Design a binder for this molecule. Structure first.
Ligand SMILES: N=C(N)NCCCCNCCCN
Lengths: 278, 280
């Protein structure tokens, strides 16, 4: 009767009954574990926290990727910071306009373990590790340092494990300034912002820093299976991007299971007390 | 282990856990097991048959969406019926609408009401007054909501805040009952009930949706991140008459000073996983 629990501030806990432990490894950056749960497939755990559960991860990767993609007029060049499990790039590649996607992940072990034991990327990670993927380019490196030197991205998506905590790319206005400069015109930057209820102060702090840097900023939430849902997301745009509208026509073709492009307006649910604190 | 923990396990082996300071109570009533816990960070936790009913710190995330959308969509909710709601959260919210003239609360387990009034106390004195039949608008009745609805009618709004549809409680999600609930409604009138965990009690949701669709003039579904329950939670709405649930009276909503449900962005109240929408 094994049990996996992740505790959050104020003593809230996300728990899963698990069948067996499959793998426990230590990388130069973090502890990586893989469990076979009872009703959610395989769970990827990084330093004791849920990265994803194979039977539910689409509830995270879909709202993280598609909203931004569908709100950009021509998302040809995309940057993903993190995304070691491969889920985000998989969703990104579903968009035909994409010509090139650069993925910068600092921990190679997360990528290899995910490709061999998680397997949600469909072969994208392996094809990328050998540098044989047509559109995807993998760079084992630091995402922050990368956008300091690189530009030309229509869409920037941050999906990181946060090795040194959330602050690295959330409380850094330096970082947001570099991200905005890295975006094409028009461009869109999107990132997960943590738990709506248990990470509220941080969420609000990132929102205000982004507000001064980008041309317009937005927030949204989504019920993510595996996390202390609802989960918050933050968006920052450069130039002509109206995040309140998505090309629903293009959405129908993605075969989404969670995010509903036809009801994009419902993506913005957010407790009133929080909205009032902005 | 170093501390005390409380967990509600749902299907699929998923659990909602709370670190607690200690267990304040456990009373096996005629109908169910009632327990109260002092949590480390969410106030007092009320549980029935092991399922979370509410945490005093965050319960408005349930009672606000359960009550106000329907209340705000109705042109004039003068007479209201609540089935269940022993804790008093629902009636508290209902009484915030000045159009309300009288409310009838039908709860089957009186223990739940007494325990709530003594160890929870989120009802702002309402439960006590009704218990001694002194409330000016609220009237309490200890019985089965399923039977009361067979001989009673004349309600602008009907709020069903029962436990999960598992046992005697199950009948509050049956067609026979929906049919009578429909008949009991004025024209226009609106019915609303909690409908279970969106991701884990999906069948409860889908089953009730179809049953309600067969009975009412129009049916709607919505969800809200309820603190303490598997998140998000589903809600089903049944309408009789011209009421468009997609619209609520925003000006009236302002006077309520809500903390969770936002009537200014009523459209956001309808989030729902695409695959579940596609199963309707
Ligand atoms: N599995 C669960 N936790 N279900 C909770 C909903 C049933 C209690 N409704 C009454 C809530 C208090 N108004």
């Amino acid at each position: 009767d094994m049990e996996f629990i992740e505790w959050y501030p104020r003593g809230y806990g996300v728990a899963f009954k698990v069948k067996r432990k499959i793998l426990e490894e230590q990388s130069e950056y973090q502890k990586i574990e893989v469990y076979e749960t009872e009703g959610f497939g395989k769970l990827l755990a990084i330093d004791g926290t849920v990265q994803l559960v194979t039977e539910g991860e689409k509830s995270y990767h879909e709202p993280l990727v598609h909203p931004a993609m569908l709100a950009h007029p021509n998302p040809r060049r995309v940057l993903i910071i993190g995304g070691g499990d491969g889920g985000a790039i998989r969703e990104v590649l579903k968009h035909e306009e994409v010509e090139e996607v650069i993925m910068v992940e600092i921990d190679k072990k997360v990528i290899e373990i995910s490709a061999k034991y998680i397997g949600i990327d469909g072969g994208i990670l392996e094809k990328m590790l050998s540098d044989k993927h047509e559109k995807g380019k993998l760079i084992i490196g630091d995402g922050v340092k990368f956008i300091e030197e690189n530009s030309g991205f229509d869409v920037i998506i941050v999906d990181s494990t946060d090795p040194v905590g959330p602050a690295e790319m959330l409380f850094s206005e330096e970082f947001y300034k570099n991200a905005y400069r890295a975006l094409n015109d028009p461009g869109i930057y999107v990132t997960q912002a943590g738990s709506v209820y248990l990470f509220t102060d941080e969420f609000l702090t990132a929102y205000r820093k982004m507000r001064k840097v980008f041309d317009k900023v937005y927030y949204y939430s989504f019920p993510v299976i595996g996390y202390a849902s609802p989960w918050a997301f933050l968006v920052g745009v450069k130039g002509s991007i109206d995040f309140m509208k998505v090309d629903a026509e293009k959405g129908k073709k993605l075969g989404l299971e969670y995010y509903d492009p036809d009801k994009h307006e419902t993506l913005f649910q957010m407790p009133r007390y929080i909205v009032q604190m902005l």
